[PDB]
Amino acid sequence: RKLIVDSVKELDSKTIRA
Amino acid sequence: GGTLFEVVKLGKSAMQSVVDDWIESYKQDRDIALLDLINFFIQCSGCRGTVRIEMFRNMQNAEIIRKMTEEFDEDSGDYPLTMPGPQWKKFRSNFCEFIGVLIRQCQYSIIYDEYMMDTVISLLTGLSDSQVRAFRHTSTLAAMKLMTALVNVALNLSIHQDNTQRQYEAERNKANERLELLLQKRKELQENQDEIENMMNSIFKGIFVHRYRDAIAEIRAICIEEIGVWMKMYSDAFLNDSYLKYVGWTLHDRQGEVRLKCLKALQSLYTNRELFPKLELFTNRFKDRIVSMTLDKEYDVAVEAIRLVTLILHGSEEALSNEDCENVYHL
């Protein structure tokens, strides 16, 4: 299936540590 | 006859013609026009299915979107908002102009009928929650342009509120019939403001605060670019810390296209020294990040950061010269 589907939709808080 | 999506893509007639033609069908049959507008956002995302009138009357936005992913009928990952070429670039422009003109034409009656806006915002919110990037990308852009259009409606209301207040005082300086009429119109315009802000609140808390931290770079860039528009166009309502915090938190984005949207959103604010008091806490908090972006590995990001730091320095107390203030206040 070629329809783009994102499992996780948002940036998690464990990677907003930038 | 052509569908609402296919008319905007072709871009033959003016977007106002399409908007006015839709409004006429809304006054003839609200459900038929809303079903066309619902399918407009579905098909603008690349989906080729069609929401049946029976689904619109018996299903929630949750199940409807689940059915439309089944009927997407695609042949690749592409969807209109990621298609290359100037043709789909004019589509994106026409798609955004349609959303703005739609609310502009509806801003004096239809927008307040508790049916159209509730139907549109509920659909865009559900689409902004779908894992399908085509639905989530297309509706987020549509919600951002919808919010800007609603901000313009709120600015017109305030202008109208002040003039209705001026008319009330002019009549009071002479109760009678006109005095009662002007009071009810003031009460009416205040209720309009509470509805428009309720809609803007639904879009911000329901879509923005989730999509500004979306996993896809351009979805974050779409949100950051539009919140800078709101703060520039309605600074009395949107230029404060509770809104700036989203731009400041996004300054550390891994993608240069998103960091550039943050800096360009701040730049249009900092070019107005009358907004520096509203930005003082933000400046103190994100001072170190902004100066660090002056040597960003992305050239466009660094150039805009240098441009931004230059405005901050020019509007500070250090840029105030003694001999100039002595020059203005002499004799």
Author numbering:
A (entry chain B): 322 to 339
B (entry chain C): 84 to 257, 263 to 419
Give the original sentences from the paper that presented this experimental model:
The STAG1–RAD21 peptide complex was obtained with a 25-residue peptide that corresponds to residues 321–345 of human RAD21. Most of these contacts are formed in the extended N-terminal half of the RAD21 peptide and are generally of the form: STAG1 side chain to RAD21 side chain. In contrast to interactions at the N-terminal half of the RAD21 peptide that are very well conserved, the helical section at the C-terminal half of the RAD21 peptide is amphipathic in nature and forms van der Waals contacts with a hydrophobic patch in the STAG1 surface that differs significantly from that observed in the STAG2 complex structure. The N-terminal region of the RAD21 peptide (shown in green for STAG1 and pink for STAG2) is highly similar and forms multiple polar contacts with STAG1/STAG2, whereas the C-terminal helical region, which forms mainly nonpolar contacts, is shifted significantly.
The complex consists of a tripartite ring comprising SMC1, SMC3, and RAD21 (also called SCC1 or Mcd1), which associates with a conserved peripheral fourth subunit that, in human somatic cells, is represented by two paralogs of the Scc3/STAG protein family, STAG1 or STAG2. The STAG1 protein is composed of HEAT repeats, a tandem repeat structural motif composed of two α helices linked by a short loop.
